Amino acid sequence: MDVLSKGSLKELLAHLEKTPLEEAISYRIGTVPYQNVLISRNEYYNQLYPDTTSLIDGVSREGQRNVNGLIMSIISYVVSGSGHYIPNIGFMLLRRSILDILTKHDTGLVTNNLNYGIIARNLTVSKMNCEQRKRMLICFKLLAYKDGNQNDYEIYLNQNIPLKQIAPNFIPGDMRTVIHNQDQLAIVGIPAYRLTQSTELSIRDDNAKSYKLGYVDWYNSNSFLRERSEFNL
Amino acid sequence: ANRATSAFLDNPHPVGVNYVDEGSRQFVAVAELLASKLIDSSRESDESNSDVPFVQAYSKFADDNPRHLRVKTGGKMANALTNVIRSYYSINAPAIVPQVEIDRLASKATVSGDMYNSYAIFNSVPIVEVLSPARTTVSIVGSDRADVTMLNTGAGAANITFNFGQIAETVILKGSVPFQLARLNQPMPAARFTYKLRPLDGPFIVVLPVGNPLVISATAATRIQVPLAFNKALVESGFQTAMNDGLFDIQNVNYYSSFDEFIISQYHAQDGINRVSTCVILGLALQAYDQMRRALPV
Amino acid sequence: DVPFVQAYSKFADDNPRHLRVKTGGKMANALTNVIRSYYSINAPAIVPQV
Amino acid sequence: RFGFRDSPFCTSLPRTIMGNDVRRISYNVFSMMEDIDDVISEGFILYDAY
Amino acid sequence: YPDADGNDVSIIFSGAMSHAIFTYAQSQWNKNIIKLDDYIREITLTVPKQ
Secondary structure, three states, X not given: OHHHHOOOHHHHHHHHHHOEHHHHEOOOOOEOOOOEEEEOOOOOXXXXXXXXXXXXXXXOEEOOOOHHHHHHHHHHHHHHOXXXXXXXXXXXXXXXXXXXXXXXXXXOOOOOOOXXXXXXXXXXXXXXXXXXXXXXXXXXXXXXXXXOOHHHHHHHHHHOHHHHHOOOOOOOOOHHHHHOOOOOOOOOOOOOOOOOOOOOOOHHHHHHHHHHHOHHHHHHHHHHHHHHHHOOO | OEEEOOHHHOOOOOOOOOOOXXXXXXXXXXXXXXXXXXXXXXXXXXXXXXXXXXXXXHHHHHOOOOOOOOOOOOHHHHHHHHHHHHHHHOOOOOOOOOHHHHHHHHOOOOOOOOXXXXXXXXXXXXXXXXXXXXXXXXXXXOOOOEEXXXXXXXXXXXXXXXXXXXXXXXXXXXXXXXEEEEEOOOOOOOOEEEEEEOOOOOOEEEEEOOOOOEEEEEXXXXXXXXXXXXXXXXXXXXXXXXXXXXXXXXXXXXXXXXXXXXXXXXXXXXXXXXXXXXXXXXXXXXXXXXXXXXXXXX | OXXXXXXXXXXXXXXXXXXXXXXXXXXXXXXXXXXXXXXXXXXXXXXXXX | OOXXXXXXXXXXXXXXXXXXXXXXEEHHHHHHOOOHHHHHHHOOEEEOOO | OEOOOOOEOOOOOOOHHHHHHHHHHHHHHHOXXXXXXXXXXXXXXXXXXX
């Protein structure tokens, strides 16, 4: 809910600096993705509603134990709000910040073999909105510039023309680009009053709607409950 | 054996998955309401011999005053309405409109955005399969009125199976000459011109006597939930306008003669009830496109 | 309708409206989908923890 | 054109700044905004008012 | 002595019926003491949508 509230690149990068990798990994066992299922939407239809499960839903799903699974878990947290179940990663790695994983070599993770096309297909980029895609491209650029793969990122953008139009205008390692960036990346914000307490047909739309409706209540009460446990640590 | 299927029911292409939320539904409803006021204001301006009613309507729709030396394009609302129409048709469309832009355009007027307040009747006839034995030829022509022409060349009478799907509500069959039709495992009645059928009542068997060809004319009615502002006449005009403007020109898509064929074909696809909700929002957007473009041609 | 409006608002966190249809709201949606999850492991988990 | 220092006048209000479209907020929405501090950091256009 | 929350528990010698009547009265009144944030949520349902 906090990560989805950020609406600027410099807010999003600041949040990733303070957030450990533990928050991007779920301890719930979940279900296997890419499964054709029938769900109940009784507000609209008497019959069951066909849908397919995906990693970028708001619900935690089982994840693979490879490096590909950990990168997919990070991106899913940014774009959907929840991570995936990857057990026994390691105490040292889980303490590191998300930005440290993406942009630093001291972590001990190797991401040179990652294929950006495969990761996008596994995350169902075709079903992602403009804000979600821009967030995903930010994570790709950070990973590419860490590995010296700047050319591969540009070539990958040439192949996918629609992704090129919405590519973020920031160069990692340059502070000027982050300062002057004017991107809008807020999936969840203070709702327009027109929003109602109604369900949505798709799994993704309903879960995104749930985050939107609960943002006002979370905004008012998160500070005190966080402080009630943070003090005397 | 031979199998005959309707042309428009074949291979429905996947539809878009964007701009179907509550906020985006309101924007389409806002565009339809504001586009209607543009048409009415132009009529009022012509009658009153004053451009003042049109200036207010254009300013609300386009966020800028009309100018004599600037082309009247409808502003940013027109661009957003055009882009969402492209996205609804196919999943391969770019879908580049920001959420901040959509939300600000839904605040121009207050509308519920509910797409289930009413219903509309669609007339496309879905013949999923016509199964004919040997020595018989069967041809299916037309969508709004389906004409099935059958010839029996063999020695004796042949039985022909008709499948109308499980979605259409009612189907009327009319023949050039009286003919016999009955459900599976049912006795055949005396020959008569007209049959009224429920498509959910299994496949239907038609007795084809040897001799002159028998032609069956089929009409069907299906009810699909639509918003209260839905108008089939304006949706049909917008569908034809969008094709001519190139809004539907994307790779790996199917083209239809009318929005009637488009919505029914997507309904009959596997897991087709997912697509029918997106098609209704597309129809409403085309209703806004027709009124806006007729008032502001480009 | 006063006793029913008070209870429905508590249950569904929304006020009944004549135009809409009363199905129980988001609480009804979660309850029905969790029921399917309990019955079989093939049924998915689609209700977020929030 | 006029040689003003830090001219507050633009020939037209820019459609895009730094490759992104400038956000436009109606005056009514901006009046009710409680997250105004986050919005002003990016910049916006106010309309629907005189 | 303090409880898990900040409330103070008094352990005294007192009669059984006076204890039962007093403590039951405390529970009935305590049911209607709610946080201001929950109170604000209740009002927002009653007031119009804007």
